[PDB]
Amino acid sequence: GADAETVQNTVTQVIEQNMNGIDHLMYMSSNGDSTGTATITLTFESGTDPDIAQVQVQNKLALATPLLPQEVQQQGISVEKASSSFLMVVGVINTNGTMN
Amino acid sequence: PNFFIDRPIFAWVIAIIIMLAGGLSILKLPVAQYPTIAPPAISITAMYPGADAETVQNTVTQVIEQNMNGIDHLMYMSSNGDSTGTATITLTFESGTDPDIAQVQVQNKLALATPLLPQEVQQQGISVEKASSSFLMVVGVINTNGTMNQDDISDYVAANMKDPISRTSGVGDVQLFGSQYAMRIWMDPNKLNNFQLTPVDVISALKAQNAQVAAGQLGGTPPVKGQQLNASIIAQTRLTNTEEFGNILLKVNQDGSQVRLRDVAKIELGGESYDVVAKFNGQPASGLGIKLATGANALDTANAIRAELAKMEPFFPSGMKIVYPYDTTPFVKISIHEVVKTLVEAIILVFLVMYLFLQNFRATLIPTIAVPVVLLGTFAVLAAFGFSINTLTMFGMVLAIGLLVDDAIVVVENVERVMAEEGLPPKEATRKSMGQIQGALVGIAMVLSAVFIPMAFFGGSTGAIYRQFSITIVSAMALSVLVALILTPALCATMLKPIQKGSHGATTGFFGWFNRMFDKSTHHYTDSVGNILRSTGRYLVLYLIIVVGMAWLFVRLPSSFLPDEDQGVFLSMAQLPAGATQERTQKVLDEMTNYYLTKEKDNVESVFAVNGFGFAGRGQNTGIAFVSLKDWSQRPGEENKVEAITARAMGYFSQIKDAMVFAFNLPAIVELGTATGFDFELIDQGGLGHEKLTQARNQLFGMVAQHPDVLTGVRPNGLEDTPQFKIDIDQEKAQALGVSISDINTTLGAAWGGSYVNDFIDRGRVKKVYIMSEAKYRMLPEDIGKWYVRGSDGQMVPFSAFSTSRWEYGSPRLERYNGLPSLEILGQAAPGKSTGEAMALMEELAGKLPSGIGYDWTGMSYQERLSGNQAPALYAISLIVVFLCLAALYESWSIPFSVMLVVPLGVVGALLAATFRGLTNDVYFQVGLLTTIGLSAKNAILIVEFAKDLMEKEGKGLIEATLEAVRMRLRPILMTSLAFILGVMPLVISSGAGSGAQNAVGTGVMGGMVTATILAIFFVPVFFVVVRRRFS
Amino acid sequence: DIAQVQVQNKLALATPLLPQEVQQQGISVEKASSSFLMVVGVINTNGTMNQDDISDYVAANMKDPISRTSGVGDVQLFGSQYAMRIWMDPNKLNNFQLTPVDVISALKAQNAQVAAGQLGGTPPVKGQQLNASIIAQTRLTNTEEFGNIL
Amino acid sequence: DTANAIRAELAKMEPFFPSGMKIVYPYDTTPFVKISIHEVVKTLVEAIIL
Amino acid sequence: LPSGIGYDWTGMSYQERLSGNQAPALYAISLIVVFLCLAALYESWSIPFS
C-alpha cells in the first residue's frame, strides 16, 4: 500500500545506498512500483562467482534492513540470482471446458 | 645458456614478454600501505538506548553469544557492553578464513538469534561488520560562519556527501562523526502533568499519526463487468515538518480545548544522537572516515575522493568548507616513491661500479638492461600470486637488489675476465664462462629458495608479513637466475666487443691508477690468504670466537615487530575520571587543542578533536583528537618529528590534574601490539560474579606488584566501577495506586533515556522521531519527583509515591571472553626479560588465584602461544635442504660444510650494525639478515665451485687451486659488495618520511654486507682447505 | 556453506509467517551429519548431584564452547538446562480468582530488565557536573524472588 | 581433527569441574579410525621388512 | 538533450559497447604476440617484419 515515490524514498534508496563496495559490480539498477514492490538488481562482471556475489549482497543488505520500514521487514526481503528471460513456459489447459 | 648464446633474439623476445607482463601487472596492481595482516574479525554491534552495562549484557550480549554456534574456523570471541547501551561482540577467525563466508555465517546465526532480543534492540538494528580500524582518510566539514552547528553540518554531510563518496570506486566503510537529523520532541513533565498526560500517551499518538495504509485500488481485480477506470488509493498522510508534529492532537478537554503536542513539548529538528561532538581547530565540524576497499589502489581511491569533494565544492552554501584533518595517502606515496628512487639509484650505482672496475661501456650496459627486466617480471609474478604493491613488498624488492645485481655482475664479470685472460672473442668467452658458472647458478637458485621459502610457512600476522617478504624475494631471485641463464649470456655474446690494445691497457688517469692499485691489492690479498692457509688452526679458533660473539649479540639484541613511523599524523586521547560529563571532557579537549595550536604551531597543522568518541569505547569521559602535522619538508630536525612532539605533549599533558590525557604515534599495524606486550584475559570460570572477579583481579595486581623485574606496566583494559542511581519500585504501593509497572517503566525510560517512536520523510529521506525530556528535567536525582504517572482512576501519581532511590556502585562497562565474564589485563615484559617468560610468570600468578577464576591469552599473545618454536624447526629443515642441494652441486658430503660455515660471518655484522645504531630485532632486520646470508652463501658457493673445478679439470693442488680461485673471484665480490653498500647507504642515513623502516632495512644489511665480504674472502678458503684436508 | 546460505535465505522469507512461539524458541539451520561423531558423558562420582544438576552444569559450562569448536555441526544435550519452573495449582488459582494469564502478566511486569536511561545524559544543560546511569529493575535471580511476586 | 579439538576443549574445562564430576566417553568412532590406520601402517612396515 | 540529462548503455548495449571499445587492443596485442613468436622462431627481426 505504498506509492512509487514512497517506495523509492523508503526502501530502494536505502538498500542501493548500502550496496557499495561489492566486488566486481558492473552496474546497478532499481525500480519502485505503485504495488509497493522494490527491486534492486546488481549485475556483476562476467566470470564473477554468483555464489560469492550473493553472499556479499546479503552481507550489505543486512546492514540496510534495520533502516527500512517495519512493514517491509515483516514482509521479508529476497536475495536471489536474477534472470530476465524465461527458459520455458509450460502451459496447462483443460479440455471439456470444465474448469475456469 | 648455450642455447640462447646462439639465439640472442629468442632471449630478447623472452625479455620483452617478461617486461610486458610486468608493465601490465604494474598497471593492474593494487597499491596500499600494508596488506591484510590481522586475522579476520567480525564485529556484532547492537544498541539498547537507555540501557546500562548490566542490562545490555543480560538482555543482548549473552543471548547473542549463546547462539553463536556452528560457525567455522573461530579462534575466540570477546564482547563488552557499556553504559551507553552498546553491545560489541567481536569474533576472530583463523588467518586463512574467507571474511565474506565468516561474516555471512555470523549474520545468519544472529538473524536466527534476533527474535530473542528486546524489541528496542531489534528496532535499532544489529550490525555485523568486518572489523577494520584503518582510517585511510577522514574528511571533515567546517563552517567559517557560526550559522551551521554540529547537527546541521552532520545532516548536510549525511544527505549530500556520503552517497557520492560511497559511489566512488574503491571505497568502503564510512563513519560520520556527527549525527543525521531527527524529529526531537522535548517533553516537559510539568506541562504533561497539567493536562494529565504521560509519555505513554505521547508515544501512542505519535505512532498513530505516522502510518502507511494499504488502501487498495478503485478498479481492483476482480472488477465489475464494464469497469473502465483503475487507480490506486492513497490514504494515510505522513507528517514531514515540525509544525505538523506539533499539531498532533493528544487530548480533548471537557470545554473543547484541544491538547496538541505543542502544549506539552518543544519540537525541533535535532540530531539523532548528541553523544558525539566533533570540533576542528575549535570550530564546529562533522567528518566522515573512509575505509579502503579490496583490490583498490589507495592512491587512486584517495584521488577519486578528492575529485568528488572538489566537484561537490560549488554546491556547498555559505562558509561550508572541506578540510582534511587526517590522511595516510601522502605518506604511502612518499614511501613508495622513496623505494622506487632507491631501486633507480641502485641501478645507477651498479652502472658506475661496473664501469669503475671494468672500464667497458657495453659491459656496464649489460646489467643495466637486466635488473629492470627482473624487477618487472617480479611485479608480474607478484600480481599473478594475488599480491599488491605495499611497504612489505617494496622493501622486499629492495632487499632483493643485492641478489639480482650480484647475478648480473657475476655473469658479466666472468665473461669479461675469461675474455681478458684467454683472449677469446666475445662469443667463445661467453660460452666458456657460462660453461664454468651455469650449474653453479642453478645450485645457487636452489639453495636460496630453501632459505626464503620457509619464511612463508610461519603462522599468524607475523606469518603473513614474512610470507609477503618471502614470496617477493623468492620470485625476484628465481627470475634473476632465469634471466642470468637466458638473456645475460646472449647480451654478453652480442654487445661485448673483443678486448684489444692489450688487457686493461688504460694506464693513464684515474682509471689507470685504479687498475694498478687494484692489481696490487689483489696480489696482497692472495698473499695474505696464502699466509692464512699456512696455519688454519688459529683462524678456526678465531671463527669460533666470532660465532660465540654472534650468539652473545643475538641474545642481547631486543626484539620488535615493526618500526614506528612519522606518518605526518598522530592521535591524542583524553580520559576524564569517573562520572564526568560531556562539558568537562570538551573543556579538556579544548585545552589540548589550544596547546597543539599554540605551543606546537610550527609542526601541527590542524587538530580534529571529537568528544564522546573513542577507539577503545564511547562515553562522555572519552575524547579523541586527530591532530595532523604539516608536510615533512616544513618540519626539519629530530625535535620536529612526531616522537619529539609526542614527548613534549606528554610533558605538558602530565600536569593536567583534571583528566588523564595521552598522546601517541600511529602504530605500523594497529592489530599488532608491542612485541614486549601481552594480552591477558581473567575469566570467571565458576559463576563467581562481578565483585569476586574484581577482587581476584586486584589480588593478581597485588602479586604483579611483586616481581617488577619481569612485568612492567600492567593495567586493566576496562573501567572501574562508578556510582549508579538505583530507582527501586515498590510493587505493593504501585498496585495500591492505579499505576501500572509498564507505565512506570515506559515513563522512566522515555523520559531519561529517550524513545525512538517511528520514522518520517524529510526532504525525500527517512529520518527518525525521538522523544525525551527537556534537559532541564533529567539532570539531577531531584528531577525524578517531577515526573507523574496516571493511575487507573485518572489521578496523576508522583514517582516518590511508589518508589525509593539510592546510590550504589556498578560497572560502567562489562566484558566477556568466550561467553564467560572476564577482565582484560594488558601489560609489558620488563626490558631485560622476554615475552615468553613474562607470560609464564603471569600464568603462574593466575594459577595462584582463588578457585573458579580462570585465565586465557588473546590478541598477539594467543598467536604467540599457538605458533611457538616453529621458526627453529622451519630453519632446521632449511639447513637440511641447503646441505642436500650443496651436496648435489659439489658431489660430496663434506664440501658443503665449507660453504655453510659463512652464515655467522654475515650475522655478526648485521648484529653489530643493529647494536651500534641502537636498533632492534624487527621484521626488516630479519629479512635483511636472510638476504645477507644468501649473498654470502652465493659468494662462498662460487669460490668453492671454482676451486673444485681447478682441482679436477686443471689438476692443480689444493692450496694452488684455492688461491687461484679466490684470486679469480675477488673482483666480482668487491664489485657486488660496493654496489650494494652504496645503494643501501641512503636508507641508513635517511631521516625523512618513512625513515624508520628505511633505517631498519639499511643498517642491518649494510653491516652484514661489510663484515660478510671482509670475513668471508679469508675464511671460506680456510673452510675449503680444512674440509678437503680432513676428508680425502 | 553455500547450501546453508541459500537454505537460510529461503527460510528468512517464511520466518515472519511462523508463530511467535516458534520464533521465540529459536530456529536452527545446521550443516551436520545424521550420525553422532561422539558422545561425551558427565558422571558425578559422589552421588550427590542427580541428572538435572549434571545437565545444567553441562549446558551452562560445556555445551557452548563445544558448539563453537570448529567442525562441530550440532550438539545435543542429553538433558536440559535449568529453568525457573513455576508449577501452577488450579485449585489455588481458582480460590484467588486467578488464571495463568494473570501469572504470565505478573511475570512479564515484575521480572524485567528495565533500561531507565542516564542521570545527566546528552544533551546536558550548561554547567552539568555529574553523569550517572540509572538502574531501575533487574531480572529476578532465585526462587525466593519469583515466589515473592505480587 | 574435530575430536582432537573437542578433547582439548574438555581438557581446558576439566580443572574447574566441581569435585566428583567426571567426564566419560561412552561413544566415539575416531579411535577405530586411528587404530585401523596404525594397523595398515604396521602392515606396510612389515611388508618392507619381509 | 538539455543539460543535466545524461545517458548510459545497459544490457546488450553495454556488452556491445565493451566489445567495440576493446576490439583495437585485441588486434594490437595479437599482432605483437605473432611478431614476437615469429622473431623467436626464425631468429630474426626482418623475417617477422616482412
CSV table of N, CA and C in Angstrom, one decimal, chain B residues 655-743:
chain,number,residue,atom,x,y,z
B,655,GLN,N,50.8,17.3,33.5
B,655,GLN,CA,50.4,18.2,34.6
B,655,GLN,C,49.0,18.6,34.6
B,656,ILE,N,48.2,18.1,33.7
B,656,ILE,CA,46.7,18.3,33.7
B,656,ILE,C,46.1,17.4,34.8
B,657,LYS,N,45.7,18.0,35.9
B,657,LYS,CA,45.2,17.3,37.0
B,657,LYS,C,43.8,16.7,36.8
B,658,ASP,N,43.0,17.4,36.1
B,658,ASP,CA,41.6,17.0,36.0
B,658,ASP,C,41.4,15.7,35.2
B,659,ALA,N,42.1,15.5,34.1
B,659,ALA,CA,41.9,14.4,33.3
B,659,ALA,C,43.2,13.5,33.3
B,660,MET,N,43.2,12.5,32.4
B,660,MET,CA,44.3,11.6,32.2
B,660,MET,C,44.5,11.5,30.7
B,661,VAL,N,45.3,12.4,30.2
B,661,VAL,CA,45.4,12.7,28.8
B,661,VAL,C,46.7,12.1,28.2
B,662,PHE,N,46.6,11.4,27.1
B,662,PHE,CA,47.8,10.8,26.5
B,662,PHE,C,47.9,11.2,25.0
B,663,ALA,N,49.1,11.2,24.5
B,663,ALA,CA,49.4,11.4,23.1
B,663,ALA,C,50.3,10.4,22.6
B,664,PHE,N,50.1,9.8,21.4
B,664,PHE,CA,50.8,8.7,21.0
B,664,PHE,C,50.9,8.7,19.4
B,665,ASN,N,51.9,8.0,18.9
B,665,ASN,CA,52.1,7.9,17.5
B,665,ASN,C,51.3,6.7,16.9
B,666,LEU,N,51.0,6.8,15.6
B,666,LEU,CA,50.3,5.7,15.0
B,666,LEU,C,51.1,4.4,15.0
B,667,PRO,N,50.5,3.3,15.3
B,667,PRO,CA,51.2,2.0,15.2
B,667,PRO,C,51.3,1.7,13.7
B,668,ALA,N,52.4,0.9,13.4
B,668,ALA,CA,52.6,0.5,12.0
B,668,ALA,C,51.4,-0.3,11.5
B,669,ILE,N,51.0,-1.3,12.3
B,669,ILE,CA,49.8,-2.1,12.1
B,669,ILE,C,49.0,-2.1,13.4
B,670,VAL,N,47.8,-1.7,13.4
B,670,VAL,CA,47.0,-1.4,14.6
B,670,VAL,C,46.8,-2.8,15.4
B,671,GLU,N,46.5,-3.8,14.7
B,671,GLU,CA,46.3,-5.1,15.3
B,671,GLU,C,47.5,-5.6,16.0
B,672,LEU,N,48.7,-5.5,15.4
B,672,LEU,CA,49.9,-5.8,16.1
B,672,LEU,C,50.1,-4.9,17.3
B,673,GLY,N,50.4,-5.5,18.4
B,673,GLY,CA,50.7,-4.7,19.6
B,673,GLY,C,52.2,-4.5,19.8
B,674,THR,N,52.6,-4.2,21.0
B,674,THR,CA,54.1,-4.1,21.3
B,674,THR,C,54.6,-5.5,21.3
B,675,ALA,N,55.8,-5.7,20.8
B,675,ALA,CA,56.4,-7.0,20.9
B,675,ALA,C,56.7,-7.5,22.3
B,676,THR,N,56.9,-6.6,23.2
B,676,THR,CA,57.0,-6.9,24.6
B,676,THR,C,55.7,-7.0,25.4
B,677,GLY,N,54.6,-6.6,24.7
B,677,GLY,CA,53.3,-6.6,25.4
B,677,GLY,C,52.6,-8.0,25.3
B,678,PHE,N,51.7,-8.2,26.3
B,678,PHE,CA,50.8,-9.4,26.3
B,678,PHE,C,49.4,-9.0,26.6
B,679,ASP,N,48.5,-9.7,26.0
B,679,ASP,CA,47.0,-9.5,26.2
B,679,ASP,C,46.5,-10.7,27.1
B,680,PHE,N,46.1,-10.4,28.3
B,680,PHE,CA,45.7,-11.4,29.3
B,680,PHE,C,44.3,-11.2,29.7
B,681,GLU,N,43.5,-12.3,29.6
B,681,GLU,CA,42.1,-12.3,30.0
B,681,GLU,C,41.9,-13.1,31.3
B,682,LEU,N,41.2,-12.5,32.2
B,682,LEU,CA,41.0,-13.1,33.5
B,682,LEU,C,39.5,-13.6,33.5
B,683,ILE,N,39.3,-14.9,33.3
B,683,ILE,CA,38.0,-15.4,33.0
B,683,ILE,C,37.4,-15.9,34.3
B,684,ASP,N,36.1,-15.6,34.5
B,684,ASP,CA,35.3,-16.1,35.6
B,684,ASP,C,34.7,-17.4,35.2
B,685,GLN,N,35.4,-18.5,35.7
B,685,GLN,CA,35.0,-19.9,35.2
B,685,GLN,C,34.0,-20.6,36.1
B,686,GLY,N,33.7,-20.0,37.3
B,686,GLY,CA,32.8,-20.7,38.2
B,686,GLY,C,31.6,-19.9,38.7
B,687,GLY,N,31.1,-19.0,37.9
B,687,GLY,CA,30.0,-18.2,38.3
B,687,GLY,C,30.2,-17.4,39.5
B,688,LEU,N,31.4,-16.9,39.7
B,688,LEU,CA,31.7,-16.2,41.0
B,688,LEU,C,31.0,-14.9,41.1
B,689,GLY,N,30.8,-14.2,40.0
B,689,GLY,CA,30.2,-12.9,39.9
B,689,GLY,C,31.2,-11.8,39.5
B,690,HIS,N,30.7,-10.6,39.4
B,690,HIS,CA,31.5,-9.4,39.1
B,690,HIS,C,32.4,-9.0,40.2
B,691,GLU,N,31.9,-9.0,41.4
B,691,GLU,CA,32.7,-8.5,42.6
B,691,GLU,C,33.8,-9.5,42.9
B,692,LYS,N,33.6,-10.8,42.9
B,692,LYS,CA,34.6,-11.7,43.1
B,692,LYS,C,35.7,-11.7,42.0
B,693,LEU,N,35.3,-11.5,40.8
B,693,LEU,CA,36.2,-11.4,39.7
B,693,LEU,C,37.1,-10.2,39.9
B,694,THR,N,36.5,-9.1,40.3
B,694,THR,CA,37.2,-7.8,40.5
B,694,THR,C,38.2,-8.0,41.7
B,695,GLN,N,37.8,-8.7,42.7
B,695,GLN,CA,38.7,-9.0,43.8
B,695,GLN,C,39.9,-9.9,43.4
B,696,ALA,N,39.6,-10.8,42.5
B,696,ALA,CA,40.6,-11.7,42.0
B,696,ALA,C,41.6,-10.9,41.2
B,697,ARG,N,41.1,-10.0,40.4
B,697,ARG,CA,42.0,-9.1,39.6
B,697,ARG,C,42.8,-8.2,40.4
B,698,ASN,N,42.2,-7.7,41.5
B,698,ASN,CA,43.0,-6.8,42.4
B,698,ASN,C,44.1,-7.6,43.1
B,699,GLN,N,43.8,-8.9,43.5
B,699,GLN,CA,44.8,-9.8,44.1
B,699,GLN,C,45.9,-10.1,43.1
B,700,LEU,N,45.5,-10.3,41.9
B,700,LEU,CA,46.5,-10.6,40.8
B,700,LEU,C,47.4,-9.3,40.6
B,701,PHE,N,46.8,-8.1,40.6
B,701,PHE,CA,47.6,-6.9,40.5
B,701,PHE,C,48.6,-6.8,41.7
B,702,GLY,N,48.1,-7.1,42.9
B,702,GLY,CA,49.0,-7.1,44.1
B,702,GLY,C,50.2,-8.0,43.9
B,703,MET,N,49.9,-9.2,43.4
B,703,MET,CA,51.0,-10.1,43.1
B,703,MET,C,51.9,-9.6,42.0
B,704,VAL,N,51.4,-9.0,41.0
B,704,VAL,CA,52.2,-8.5,39.9
B,704,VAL,C,53.0,-7.2,40.4
B,705,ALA,N,52.6,-6.6,41.4
B,705,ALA,CA,53.4,-5.5,42.0
B,705,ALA,C,54.7,-6.1,42.5
B,706,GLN,N,54.6,-7.2,43.2
B,706,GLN,CA,55.8,-8.0,43.4
B,706,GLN,C,56.3,-8.6,42.0
B,707,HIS,N,57.6,-9.0,42.0
B,707,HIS,CA,58.2,-9.3,40.7
B,707,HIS,C,58.1,-8.2,39.7
B,708,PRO,N,58.6,-7.0,40.0
B,708,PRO,CA,58.6,-5.9,39.0
B,708,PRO,C,59.7,-6.1,38.0
B,709,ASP,N,60.6,-7.1,38.2
B,709,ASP,CA,61.8,-7.3,37.3
B,709,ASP,C,61.4,-8.0,36.0
B,710,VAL,N,60.1,-8.5,35.9
B,710,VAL,CA,59.7,-9.3,34.7
B,710,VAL,C,58.5,-8.6,34.1
B,711,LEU,N,57.6,-8.1,34.9
B,711,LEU,CA,56.4,-7.4,34.4
B,711,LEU,C,56.5,-5.9,34.6
B,712,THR,N,56.2,-5.1,33.6
B,712,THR,CA,56.1,-3.7,33.8
B,712,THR,C,54.9,-3.2,33.1
B,713,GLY,N,54.3,-2.2,33.7
B,713,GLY,CA,53.1,-1.5,33.1
B,713,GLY,C,51.9,-2.4,32.9
B,714,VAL,N,51.6,-3.2,33.9
B,714,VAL,CA,50.3,-3.9,33.8
B,714,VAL,C,49.2,-3.0,34.3
B,715,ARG,N,48.0,-3.2,33.6
B,715,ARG,CA,46.9,-2.3,33.8
B,715,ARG,C,45.6,-3.0,33.3
B,716,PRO,N,44.5,-2.6,33.8
B,716,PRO,CA,43.2,-3.1,33.2
B,716,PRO,C,43.0,-2.5,31.9
B,717,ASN,N,42.2,-3.2,31.0
B,717,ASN,CA,41.8,-2.6,29.8
B,717,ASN,C,40.3,-2.1,29.8
B,718,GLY,N,39.8,-2.1,31.0
B,718,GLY,CA,38.4,-1.7,31.2
B,718,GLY,C,38.2,-0.5,32.1
B,719,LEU,N,37.0,-0.3,32.7
B,719,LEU,CA,36.7,0.8,33.5
B,719,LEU,C,36.3,0.3,34.9
B,720,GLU,N,36.8,1.1,35.9
B,720,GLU,CA,36.5,0.8,37.3
B,720,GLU,C,35.0,1.1,37.6
B,721,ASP,N,34.5,0.6,38.6
B,721,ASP,CA,33.1,0.8,39.0
B,721,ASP,C,32.9,2.3,39.3
B,722,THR,N,31.7,2.8,39.0
B,722,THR,CA,31.2,4.1,39.3
B,722,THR,C,29.9,4.1,40.0
B,723,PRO,N,29.6,5.2,40.8
B,723,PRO,CA,28.3,5.2,41.4
B,723,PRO,C,27.2,5.3,40.4
B,724,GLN,N,26.1,4.6,40.7
B,724,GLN,CA,24.9,4.5,39.9
B,724,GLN,C,23.7,4.8,40.7
B,725,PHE,N,22.7,5.3,40.1
B,725,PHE,CA,21.5,5.7,40.7
B,725,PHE,C,20.4,4.6,40.6
B,726,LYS,N,20.0,4.1,41.7
B,726,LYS,CA,19.1,3.0,41.7
B,726,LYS,C,17.7,3.5,42.1
B,727,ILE,N,16.7,3.3,41.1
B,727,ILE,CA,15.3,3.6,41.3
B,727,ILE,C,14.6,2.3,41.6
B,728,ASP,N,14.2,2.1,42.9
B,728,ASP,CA,13.5,0.9,43.3
B,728,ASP,C,12.0,1.1,43.4
B,729,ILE,N,11.3,0.3,42.7
B,729,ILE,CA,9.8,0.5,42.6
B,729,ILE,C,9.2,-0.5,43.6
B,730,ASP,N,8.4,0.0,44.5
B,730,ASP,CA,7.6,-0.8,45.4
B,730,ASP,C,6.4,-1.3,44.7
B,731,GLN,N,6.3,-2.7,44.5
B,731,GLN,CA,5.2,-3.2,43.8
B,731,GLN,C,3.9,-3.1,44.6
B,732,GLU,N,3.9,-3.2,45.9
B,732,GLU,CA,2.7,-3.1,46.7
B,732,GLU,C,2.1,-1.7,46.6
B,733,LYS,N,3.0,-0.7,46.7
B,733,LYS,CA,2.5,0.7,46.6
B,733,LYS,C,2.0,0.9,45.1
B,734,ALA,N,2.7,0.4,44.1
B,734,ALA,CA,2.3,0.6,42.8
B,734,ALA,C,0.9,0.0,42.5
B,735,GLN,N,0.6,-1.2,43.0
B,735,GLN,CA,-0.7,-1.8,42.8
B,735,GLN,C,-1.7,-1.2,43.7
B,736,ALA,N,-1.3,-0.6,44.9
B,736,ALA,CA,-2.3,0.1,45.7
B,736,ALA,C,-2.9,1.3,45.0
B,737,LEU,N,-2.0,2.0,44.3
B,737,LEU,CA,-2.5,3.1,43.4
B,737,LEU,C,-2.9,2.4,42.1
B,738,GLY,N,-3.4,3.2,41.2
B,738,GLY,CA,-3.8,2.7,39.9
B,738,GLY,C,-2.7,2.6,38.9
B,739,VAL,N,-1.5,2.9,39.3
B,739,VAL,CA,-0.4,2.9,38.3
B,739,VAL,C,0.1,1.5,38.0
B,740,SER,N,0.5,1.3,36.8
B,740,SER,CA,1.0,0.0,36.3
B,740,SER,C,2.4,0.0,36.0
B,741,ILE,N,3.1,-1.1,36.2
B,741,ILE,CA,4.5,-1.2,36.0
B,741,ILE,C,5.0,-0.9,34.6
B,742,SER,N,4.2,-1.3,33.6
B,742,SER,CA,4.5,-0.9,32.2
B,742,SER,C,4.5,0.6,32.0
B,743,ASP,N,3.5,1.3,32.6
B,743,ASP,CA,3.5,2.7,32.5
B,743,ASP,C,4.7,3.3,33.2
